[PDB]
């Protein structure tokens, strides 16, 4: 009967594993309080799913955007260096304006 519930719980566990893996990849540490709260019998699963969906989607979008923007930044800095050195090369005697 409850295989739907157990499947969704497994998906939540996968989300938490992914976020924890990103945590380890970063230098940030993982706290340890010692509390052992009980799972909320009422449909707090919806709230937990929303929270973890945010914490995963935001991190994935952040990673993708970081990768793309780093690529663009590197390409643009290469272009900047190329422009500067081409200007340097075109400096023997630039009597004409164009």
Partner 1 sequence: IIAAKAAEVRANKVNWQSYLQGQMISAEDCEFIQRFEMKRCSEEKQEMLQTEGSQCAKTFINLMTHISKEQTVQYILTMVDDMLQENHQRVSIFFDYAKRSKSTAWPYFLPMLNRQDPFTVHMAARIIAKLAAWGKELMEGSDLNYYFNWIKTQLSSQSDSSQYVQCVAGCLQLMLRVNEYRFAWVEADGVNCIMGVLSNKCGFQLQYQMIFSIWLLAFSPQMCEHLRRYNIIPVLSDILQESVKEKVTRIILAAFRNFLEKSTERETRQEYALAMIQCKVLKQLENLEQQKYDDEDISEDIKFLLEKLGESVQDLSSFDEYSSELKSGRLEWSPVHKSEKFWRENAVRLNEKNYELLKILTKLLEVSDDPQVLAVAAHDVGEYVRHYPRGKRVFEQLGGKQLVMNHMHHEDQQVRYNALLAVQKLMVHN
CA dihedral over 50, 56, 59, 62, signed as positive or negative: negative
CA dihedral over 64, 68, 69, 74, signed as positive or negative: positive
Binding map of partner 1 across residues 34-53, x = CB under 8 A, - = no contact: -------xxx-xx---x---
Q: For partner 1, which is the closer residue by CB, 19 or 69? A: 69
Q: Contact at 8 Å (CB) between 44 and 54?
A: no
82 near partner 1 (CB under 8 A): no
Q: Would you tell me which residues interact with partner 1 (CB under 8 A)?
A: 1, 4, 41-43, 45-46, 50, 61, 65, 68-69, 72, 75-76
């Amino acid at each position: 009967k409850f295989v739907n519930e157990v499947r969704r719980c497994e998906e939540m566990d996968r989300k938490l594993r992914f976020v924890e893996k990103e945590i380890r990849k970063a230098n940030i540490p993982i706290m340890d309080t010692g509390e052992n709260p009980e799972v909320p019998f009422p449909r707090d699963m919806i709230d937990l799913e929303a929270n973890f969906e945010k914490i995963e989607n935001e991190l994935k979008e952040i990673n993708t955007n970081q990768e793309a923007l780093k690529r663009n930044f590197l390409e643009l800095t290469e272009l900047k260096f190329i422009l500067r050195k081409t200007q340097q090369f075109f400096d023997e005697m630039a009597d004409p304006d164009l």
